Design a protein around this ligand. Structure first.
Ligand SMILES: [Zn+2]
Ligand SMILES: [Zn+2]
Ligand SMILES: [Zn+2]
Length: 308
């Protein structure tokens, strides 16, 4: 049955009904057979023609395995009040206000039964936990603060699956040298300079608004770096004054383990001349002959269904 409280502001009043789901909205909270914004986002994300790069590389069963790790991060210590359904015997008026209850145990069971076709659908279902807490307990209750942090963890984990599902699973399991594991579409290796930090080796995971999502060898920290401050990996080092030599040496050692792993899996790794700029979705390091780019990639391909 249809909800009585607006999905945006969590208050009652004259509200519009979605044709596909039980959510309701004030016309003014959206600034104008109707399908709500949650249903529109999910439909686009689950259509093969408009699905994300992460969804193109995953089956529904594979996505269910990654959502189980996201549930573990959402179940932080102190989230006890949201780990099981609200006991109606202990709050006898709960169902007079909450028509669509949700909790972390129910969210975990729906993920296991392969109910979710995209990351957007898991976050949209998780959000009933916060919406219900605000209606019943109030916007300034101690439990509402806990529910807001649970939703922010869920948002972060969905964003991490979408950046690269293989990096996500490697970071979850933490095998020895997990950061040196190459992905099926290998991330280019760069020298990256962040303002105020020395030039350092990093993996380039994404390109957005003239920036590169860099993941640094050694500490495994991350930052958006300007594209003009990124060069393809080279033997000559762009020198920077550094506080501790041994930390730089460990990062370079870990970087050389990643390069040998790449050469075993794909059969090639091309270092570039000094100060060669990084370009979006660079293919230079995988070329069969770096002086003949028209010849293309070295990857032979054996029609492998390998993935899991
Ligand atoms: Zn509203
Ligand atoms: Zn809807
Ligand atoms: Zn990756």
């Amino acid at each position: 049955r249809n909800d009585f409280y607006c999905w945006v502001c969590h208050r009652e009043g004259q509200v519009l009904c979605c044709e596909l789901c039980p959510r309701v909205y004030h016309a003014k909270c959206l600034r104008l057979d109707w399908f709500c914004p949650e249903c529109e986002k999910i439909t686009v994300a689950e259509c093969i023609e408009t699905q994300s790069k992460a969804m193109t590389m995953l089956t529904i069963e594979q996505l269910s395995y990654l959502l189980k790790f996201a549930i573990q991060k959402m179940k932080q210590p102190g989230t006890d009040a949201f780990q099981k359904p609200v006991p109606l015997e202990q709050h006898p008026d709960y169902a007079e206000y909450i028509f669509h209850p949700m909790d972390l145990c129910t969210l975990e069971k729906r993920a296991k039964k392969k109910h979710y076709g995209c990351t957007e659908a898991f976050l949209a279902d998780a959000k009933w936990i916060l919406h219900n807490c605000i209606i019943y307990n109030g916007g300034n209750h101690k439990l509402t603060q806990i529910a807001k942090v649970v939703i922010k963890i869920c948002e972060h984990e969905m964003n991490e699956i979408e950046v690269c599902p293989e990096c996500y699973l490697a970071a979850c399991q933490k095998r020895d040298n997990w950061f040196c594991e190459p992905c099926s579409n290998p991330h280019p290796l760069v020298w990256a300079k962040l303002k105020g930090f020395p030039f350092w080796p990093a993996k380039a995971l994404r390109d957005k608004d003239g920036q590169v999502d860099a993941r640094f060898f050694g500490q495994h920290d991350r930052a958006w770096v300007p594209i003009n401050n990124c060069y393809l990996m080279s033997k000559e080092i762009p020198f920077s004054v550094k506080k501790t030599k041994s930390i730089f040496n460990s990062a370079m050692q870990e970087m050389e383990v990643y390069v040998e792993n790449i050469r075993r899996k794909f059969g090639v790794f091309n270092y570039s001349p000094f100060r060669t700029p990084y370009t979006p979705n660079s293919q230079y390091q995988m070329l069969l002959d770096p002086t003949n780019p028209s010849a293309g990639t070295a990857k032979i391909d054996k029609q492998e269904k390998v993935k899991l």
